[PDB]
C-alpha cells in the first residue's frame, strides 16, 4: 500500500441543507480500486451505510436512499454527499477504500471524518 487518502478532520453542514464529505486520493499504478465503503459510528463500532463494488452503488439503508451520492467521475474522488441533513446525521463518518495489487492481494485503508450539523 498505497495511495494516500486525503480527508478533512471535520465538516460542518446546514440542517436540511446538503454537505459533501471529502475523500479523495491520487490514483497509483499497482493499486486498482475494487471497493469503496462509507461507514458511520454506532456505539463502539462502525456500520456500513454505502458500498460501491462491481455491481455499482448500494445504500445499505432506506433512510439514506436518495440522500447519499458518492463522487464517480474524477478518478480517486469518492467523496460522500448527504442530501437534506438531519440533526441525527451528526456523527463520525468513515471513508474506506480497498485497492487490489498485482499480487491479487488487497490493501484496505480508511479515514475518519467528523460531521457537524448547524442551525
Amino acid at each position, epitope marked *: 500500500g498505497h495511495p*494516500t487518502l486525503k480527508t478533512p*478532520e471535520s465538516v460542518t453542514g446546514t440542517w436540511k441543507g446538503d454537505v459533501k464529505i471529502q475523500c479523495i486520493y491520487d490514483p497509483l499504478r499497482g493499486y486498482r480500486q475494487v471497493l469503496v465503503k462509507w461507514l458511520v459510528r454506532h456505539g463502539s463500532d462502525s456500520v456500513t451505510i454505502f458500498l460501491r463494488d462491481s455491481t455499482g452503488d448500494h445504500i445499505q439503508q432506506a433512510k439514506y436512499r436518495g440522500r447519499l451520492k458518492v463522487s464517480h467521475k474524477v478518478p480517486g474522488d469518492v467523496s460522500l454527499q448527504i442530501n437534506t441533513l438531519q440533526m441525527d446525521d451528526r456523527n463520525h463518518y468513515t471513508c474506506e477504500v480497498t485497492w487490489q495489487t498485482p499480487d491479487g492481494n488487497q490493501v*484496505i*485503508r*480508511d*479515514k*475518519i471524518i467528523e460531521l457537524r450539523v448547524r442551525k
Partner: nanobody, 125 residues
Framework: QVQLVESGGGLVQAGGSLRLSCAAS????????MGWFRQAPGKEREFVAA????????YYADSVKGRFTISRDNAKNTVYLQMNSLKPEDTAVYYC??????????????????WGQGTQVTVSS
C-alpha cells in the same frame, strides 16, 4: 489537532515490567486511532501496538503479542502501553502516535499524522 507527550520511560531489569503513558491534547480524540512505535539504535522505527477510538479494539506486533497490552482512557484523552517480560532487545525510544484511521493501517507509520517526542526505555541484561 493533537500534541502528544510521552512519559514513564526509564531503566528496567530484564524480565521486568514498565507502563508508558501518553497525553494527547486537543478535542477530537475520538477521531483518532492511537499507536505505539519504537526505534532502537541503528534501526528503523517499528510498530508495537495500537488501539481504536472505541477504547477496546487493539492491535499488536508479533514481537510483543502475549507480553504487551495497550489501553486507552477516552475521557482523559490518554493511552498507555503495559510492557511485561522485557528483554534487552526491547530497548529503544518509544513513540506515542495518532492518526485518523478507523480499523485499518494501524501498523504503518504513514497512517499517523501526529507524533510525540518519544521516551527512552532501557532494558539491562
Amino acid at each position: 489537532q493533537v500534541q502528544l507527550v510521552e512519559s514513564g520511560g526509564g531503566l528496567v531489569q530484564a524480565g521486568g515490567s514498565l507502563r508508558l503513558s501518553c497525553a494527547a491534547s486537543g478535542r477530537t480524540f475520538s477521531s483518532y486511532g492511537m499507536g505505539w512505535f519504537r526505534q532502537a539504535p541503528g534501526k528503523e522505527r517499528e510498530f508495537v501496538a495500537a488501539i481504536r477510538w472505541n477504547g477496546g479494539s487493539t492491535y499488536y506486533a508479533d514481537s510483543v503479542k502475549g507480553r504487551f497490552t495497550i489501553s486507552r482512557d477516552n475521557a482523559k484523552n490518554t493511552v498507555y502501553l503495559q510492557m511485561n517480560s522485557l528483554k534487552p532487545e526491547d530497548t529503544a525510544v518509544y513513540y506515542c502516535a495518532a492518526g485518523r484511521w478507523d480499523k485499518y493501517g494501524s501498523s504503518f507509520q504513514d497512517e499517523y499524522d501526529y507524533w510525540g517526542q518519544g521516551t527512552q526505555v532501557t532494558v539491562s541484561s
